[PDB]
Design a protein around this ligand. Structure first.
Ligand code: SF4
Ligand code: SF4
Ligand SMILES: [Ca+2]
Ligand SMILES: [Ca+2]
Ligand SMILES: [Ca+2]
Ligand SMILES: [Cl-]
Lengths: 354, 630
């Protein structure tokens, strides 16, 4: 079926899934049970951005289902697909909100799930200064764990934040990637709906930094499209639900690139089969220009490795501290004393260690 | 009370001046014609010999059923239709034939030369002419010889463009409508329409289809391709449209007609230092060159020359009293201009021995010395500024900006901007094909056509274009239809937010183009066939499988009939704003608007209401999308 009916199918599936879990919350916890996300002043960001209304109980969460229904208009026109994509996003938030209601601890390690408001504030400044050039939203499954780790480690090397959702989390673990908020690689969850918490990062950035008010959907979608440098990288087979999420990402102005054959849309939905080119395509697709310094060193160099916790067992050499004498200094001298690029390692080297 | 004459305020203003001046216009002569013969309007009147004239009944079962020879209404109507196609094909045939002869006389230190060498190298490949280590002029002459053969070769096979899908060629072959030499097919239709020859509606209509193909894929194509070789391939360029382009204190030289060689030489002549100084000697600021109809489109596309107006505006241009010289060549030149120019100082100069108009200054265009001949004609227009009556001059202060030069090469270049360097391929129509399959753009329509007093001037053109772009259908325009849009202001980048739908506005912003693309003159409709062909070939389908359509909201010329016919025979549905004379032939109506679909995958649609036409185009496109699975 064509791209439109594929999006409408996945959006209707997302509505059906949200209708099922919402009923479970009504039957188990009642319509008065409080619904809320861990540490957030915007209740359910997506619903608060679209309607400007805050959802506080299961009964109000039930009413939010009508927002998903209203956004799905099965007419073949671009504005209708994008609205259908947002219906998938609202449904994903409803499902994720009900997950926290029906479970004391819905997320298991290494998954993070909902991202707290202070973390959004923490990443806001580095996004503005360009320290975080982009946010790579990787979803799906790669042919092997070697390709998944090469792509993550490359994005992390560029300092782009990398958010993983699906089997790519298991593949990255096997391929030895260093995950963590400071390491700029955050695993959200295995379910497709877990991608909504990154969407909330972009929406909350418009409310927090952009200073946009709730209900101003057109203004929030403009902020994410022009200011939040995000893009999606969907690997492995794509289900109808995943394609609807892709339409939701496109609605926020984020291009979606996939290794699977799909009906392409220039500068929006693209298809790259070569994994060794994926990173370069994604950056070009979202106008992310990386200022490469090109230092001649055998190890990586990026802002993600800041505040590294090199502990005793994982360490080989130690200098300074209440252990040995260490110092640093910068001097001003004439052109005669300085011989431009000159590296002289007086004393023993790390090879001498045993 | 009385129906409006036009939707353009500049046109309406000069029409009032024409009444005050006491001159007659095409709109006035339309009223004088009063009720038009129904027999002729239904196509049931035959004059193909001196046994008549015969006139059978358009309503079957009553009145006279057959002609003196025995021809039924369906036979009479089908032959009448055929002859219009054969006449339309002939107009474009001589046009391209002249261009090819010019290509055969190109030289490195000559008046006519090859400007686009790359295009010539590509065209030479299709005609099987070698290019490796050879003079560009030796290649140009061999190409011209191969191109000229397509007009009258009696043995062998004709050379067709590469953009034409093999599925479309095989369909024509099996249907028995594969094209032969250009002039040969015109003779074939004229022979079979003769008394006592063909008396079968289906066979006759198939003969017109075969003939019309020699226009679109041969006469027009070669006319367009060779014009781009000698005068340059068009590219995105800016210009002003409407009668407000004329300047009161400058010499106004209006070029009307269709032949591009004369207009290309009058442009170069306007840059001769002696002529620029002669204009000042007479008391003018400079030389203000303007165009009208095709010849104007062909110069605005390549050199950004300003457009004075379309078909029905040609008389009102003289009424401004500012046209010093009106140089005409051939086709769509109303003979009334000879009588009208007498009431003003305007000089009506005819140049082609093909179109001689009585009581007009005749200055033949010497093709041997083209630039010198062009300078002699332009000098006469400059000197005529001395007889301008500045007190009675009235140029409405109404002009509009426009962007054109959207050739297939240019459209591909602009589409490359939305291609990823690490993934997408380059210099292909893929971005357009991708947007159509995805559904962002519901389809692509081609609004072409003339001006007819049966329709409010430009009314159906604008209403049709507007409705299509609003429904996410990218619109391409040519001829008077393109000019109608240029005058209104649809050929602007800002027209996307103002009128385009959600998807088309997005594509317009990404590719950086207006929602309406001016592809050139009516001969340049071959570029539309070329574009639709590349999309079909790239997707591995026939042209009938794509969500594409053609529209002629206002049309008159027999060229529009041949155009419509080859567009439908090529697999593209066509909507007609003016009803052709087929009403009286029930079998012919069924063939044209129904059975034809079973033969070529496309059909004709007659709809005078433009609002109903856009509804039908969208519904039809969707039907073809659902069949294809897009
Ligand atoms: S010749 Fe025919 S179309 Fe003309 S006025 Fe006579 S009946 Fe009518
Ligand atoms: S060909 Fe037949 S219908 Fe036509 S004028 Fe002659 S007798 Fe009449
Ligand atoms: Ca050709
Ligand atoms: Ca321009
Ligand atoms: Ca002359
Ligand atoms: Cl192509």
């Amino acid at each position: 079926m064509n791209l439109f009916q594929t999006v409408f199918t996945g959006s209707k599936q997302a509505l059906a899934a949200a209708e099922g879990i919402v009923k479970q919350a009504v039957d188990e916890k009642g319509r008065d049970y409080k619904v809320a996300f861990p540490d957030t002043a915007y209740s359910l960001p997506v619903i608060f951005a679209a309607t400007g209304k805050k959802i506080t109980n299961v009964g109000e969460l039930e009413g939010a289902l009508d927002i998903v229904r209203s956004l799905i208009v099965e007419e073949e026109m671009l504005d209708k697909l994008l609205n259908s994509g947002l219906a998938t996003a609202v449904a994903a938030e409803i499902i994720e909100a009900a997950k926290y209601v029906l479970s004391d601890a819905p997320y298991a390690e290494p998954c993070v799930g909902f991202i707290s408001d202070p973390i959004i504030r923490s990443l806001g400044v580095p996004l503005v200064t360009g320290d975080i050039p982009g946010v790579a939203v990787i979803l799906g499954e790669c042919p092997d764990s070697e390709t998944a780790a090469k792509i993550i480690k490359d994005y992390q090397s560029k300092g782009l934040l990398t958010c993983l959702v699906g089997k790519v989390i298991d593949q990255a673990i096997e391929g030895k990637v260093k995950m963590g908020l400071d390491l700029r690689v955050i695993p959200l969850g295995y379910d497709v709906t877990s991608v909504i918490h990154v969407v909330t990062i972009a929406i909350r950035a418009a409310l927090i930094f952009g200073g946009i008010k709730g209900g101003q959907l057109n203004d929030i979608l403009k902020y994410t499209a022009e200011r939040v440098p995000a893009f999606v990288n969907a690997f492995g087979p794509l289900s109808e639900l995943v394609v609807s999420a892709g339409a939701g990402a496109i609605a926020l102005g984020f291009p979606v690139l996939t290794d699977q054959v799909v009906p392409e849309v220039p500068t929006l939905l693209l298809t790259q089969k070569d994994y060794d080119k994926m990173v370069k395509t994604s950056l070009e697709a979202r106008n992310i220009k990386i200022k490469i310094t090109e230092i001649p060193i055998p190890v990586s160099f990026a802002a993600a490795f800041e505040g590294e916790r090199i502990r005793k067992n994982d360490m080989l050499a130690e200098f300074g501290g209440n252990k040995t004498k260490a110092w640093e200094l910068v001097m001003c001298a004439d052109q005669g004393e300085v011989e431009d690029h000159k590296i002289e390692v007086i004393g023993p080297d790390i090879d001498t260690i045993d | 009370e009385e129906k409006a004459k036009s939707i353009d305020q500049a046109t309406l203003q000069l029409l009032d001046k024409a009444k005050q001046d006491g001159v007659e216009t095409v709109w006035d002569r339309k009223a004088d014609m009063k009720v038009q013969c129904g027999f002729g309007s239904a196509g049931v009147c035959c004059r193909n010999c001196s046994m008549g004239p015969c006139r059978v009944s358009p309503v079957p079962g009553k009145g006279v059923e057959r002609g003196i020879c025995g021809a039924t209404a369906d036979v009479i109507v089908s032959r009448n239709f055929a002859r219009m196609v054969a006449a339309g094909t002939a107009a474009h045939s001589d046009h391209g034939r002249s261009i090819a002869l010019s290509l055969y006389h190109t030289s490195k230190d000559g008046d006519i030369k090859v400007k686009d060498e790359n295009k010539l190298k590509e065209v030479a490949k299709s005609f099987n002419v070698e290019t490796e280590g050879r003079d560009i002029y030796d290649i140009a002459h061999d190409v011209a010889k191969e191109g000229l053969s397509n007009y009258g070769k009696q043995l062998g096979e004709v050379t067709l463009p590469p953009s034409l899908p093999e599925k479309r060629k095989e369909l024509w072959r099996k249907l028995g409508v594969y094209p032969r030499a250009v002039d040969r097919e015109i003779a074939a239709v004229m022979h079979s329409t003769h008394i006592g020859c063909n008396a079968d509606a289906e066979a006759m209509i198939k003969m017109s289809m075969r003939c019309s193909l020699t226009d679109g894929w041969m006469g027009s194509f070669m006319g367009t391709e060779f014009s781009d070789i000698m005068f340059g391939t068009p590219h995105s360029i800016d210009t002003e449209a409407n009668l407000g382009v004329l300047e009161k204190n400058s010499v106004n030289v209006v070029l009307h007609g269709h032949e591009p060689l004369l207009s290309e030489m009058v442009v170069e002549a306007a840059s001769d230092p002696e002529l620029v100084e002669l204009a000042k000697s007479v008391g003018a600021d400079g030389i203000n060159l303007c165009g009208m109809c095709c010849t104007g489109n062909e110069v605005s596309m390549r050199h950004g020359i300003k457009i004075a107006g379309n078909f029905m505006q040609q008389e009102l241009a003289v009424v401004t009293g500012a046209v010093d010289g009106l140089i005409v060549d051939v086709q769509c030149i109303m003979p009334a201009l000879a009588k009208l120019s007498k009431s003003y100082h305007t000089k009506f100069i005819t140049t082609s021995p093909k179109a001689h108009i009585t009581d007009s200054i005749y200055m033949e265009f010497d093709e041997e010395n083209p630039l010198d001949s062009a300078k002699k004609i332009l000098k006469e227009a400059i000197l005529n500024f001395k007889n301008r009556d500045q007190s009675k001059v009235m140029i409405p202060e109404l002009k509009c900006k426009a962007i054109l030069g959207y050739s297939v090469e240019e459209i591909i270049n602009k589409l490359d901007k939305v291609v990823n360097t690490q993934i997408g391929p380059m210099q292909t129509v893929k971005p357009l094909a991708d947007v159509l399959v995805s559904g962002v753009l519901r389809g692509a329509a081609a609004v072409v056509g003339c001006n007819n007093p049966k329709v409010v001037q430009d009314s159906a053109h604008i209403e049709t274009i507007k409705g299509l772009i609003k429904n996410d259908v990218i619109v391409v325009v040519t001829g008077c239809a393109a000019q109608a849009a240029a005058k209104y202001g649809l050929l602007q980048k800002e027209a996307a937010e103002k009128y385009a739908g959600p998807g088309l506005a997005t594509v317009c912003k990404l590719v950086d183009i207006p929602p309406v693309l001016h592809m050139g003159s009516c001969v340049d409709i071959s570029r539309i066939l070329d574009l639709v062909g590349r999309v079909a070939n790239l997707l591995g389908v026939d042209m009938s499988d794509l969500p594409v359509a053609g529209v002629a909201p206002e049309w008159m010329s027999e060229k529009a009939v041949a155009i419509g016919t080859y567009v439908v025979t090529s697999g593209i549905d066509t909507w007609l704003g003016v009803a052709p004379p087929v009403t009286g032939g029930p079998e012919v109506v069924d063939i044209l608007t129904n059975k034809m679909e079973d033969w070529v995958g496309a059909k004709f649609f007659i709809e005078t209401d433009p609002h109903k036409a856009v509804e039908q185009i969208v519904n039809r496109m969707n039907e073809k999308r659902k069949k294809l699975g897009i």
